[model samples]
Target chain A: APQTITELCSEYRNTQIYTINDKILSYTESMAGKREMVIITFKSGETFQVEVPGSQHIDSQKKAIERMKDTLRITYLTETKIDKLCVWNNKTPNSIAAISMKN
Target chain B: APQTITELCSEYRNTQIYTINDKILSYTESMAGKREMVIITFKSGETFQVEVPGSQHIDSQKKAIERMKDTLRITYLTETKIDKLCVWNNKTPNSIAAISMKN
Candidate 1:
């Protein structure tokens, strides 16, 4: 069973999420309705949505849970300073390979 | 037969090809020898070259001619102030259509 956001929040009480221009937009609670939808728009005009399934809304909730999992993973890395683990001085080795391949 | 660059310049006397930084790198005379190449490196680290063909360098010249044709078309639009022909309030109709299509 997936953990609820409230439960996750309780688990990571010391975590901090910083926003650049405005407050972090909350998408919890509103994710309850089976057919409910929410739009997230970026300053660059890119947009995304949360869509639910026709049957039980279980699949939609599941999809949302997967997204939350991915987000939590990133947040965990940031919080624990794990994102700096593989820091490189210059462009990654893959970028050099890509340019050589192009040539 | 395609027109030479000198001929095109004569045809568009009033058109100004404004250079934001350095002058347009000239590759006219050097584009004559086969397998003889020139590397142009931009300030952004992007680079490209012009390579001539077998026997008479005809194919490379032809390719360069096509590139010049497209460049001239864009230059003509900028020169004649034709890029503003599809003017609209706030944004264009195509942008609105794209948003609706995405939704």
Candidate 2:
């Protein structure tokens, strides 16, 4: 599997992606009050902040994306080994993570 | 501190976010062709796919976002404990993971 943010981004080349008003989406606090930090990166470290809300309006975004008639995305880049929730020495040394898909 | 993705997304409310042409943004393969899978989700299990590209044009996207005069972001929703690299039997009991930062 591809490791590192750079490798992760190699999948989409000429294809167009839908985006927000700006790049550098923040994945920290959501509309309801989730506390965490999420950042998406790309070539030359293209950063974007994300505004994730509770499922209340979340369904709204999903419905919108679904209208596109295809599964779209926002991927975070980082590196680490995932044993799929295994046991013993599961520390992610410099590990970063997560994903969402239109199914 | 937020555990599940729902808790994580509770942080962003009443805000506009940047996005691709569609609602989903993937974190799997990039333009160059590294393979992995990334998806985004929301209320009622709303899902979206993402398109991540290599850093070649990644720099381009960064400059664009920077022009916006702020750090934006896209966060993947999932839940797990991140001790930031610790020791001992570090297995993630059903642990799902990684993250990126705008700094």
Best by lDDT: 2
Over A1-103, each residue of candidate 1 has an lDDT whose tens digit, in order, gives 3243233333432332222232112111111112122222223332223332244546655455335323422232233221111111132110000000000
Using TM-score as the measure, which candidate wins? 2
lDDT, candidate 1, at A22: 23
Against the native complex, each candidate's DockQ, computed on alpha carbons, is 0.01, 0.04
Model 2 TM-score is 0.21
Deviating ranges (above 4 Å) for candidate 1 = A1-29, A56-103, B1-103
- Give lDDT: candidate 1, residue A62: 49
Determine which window of 10 residues in candidate 2 chain B has minimal summed lDDT. Answer: B80-89
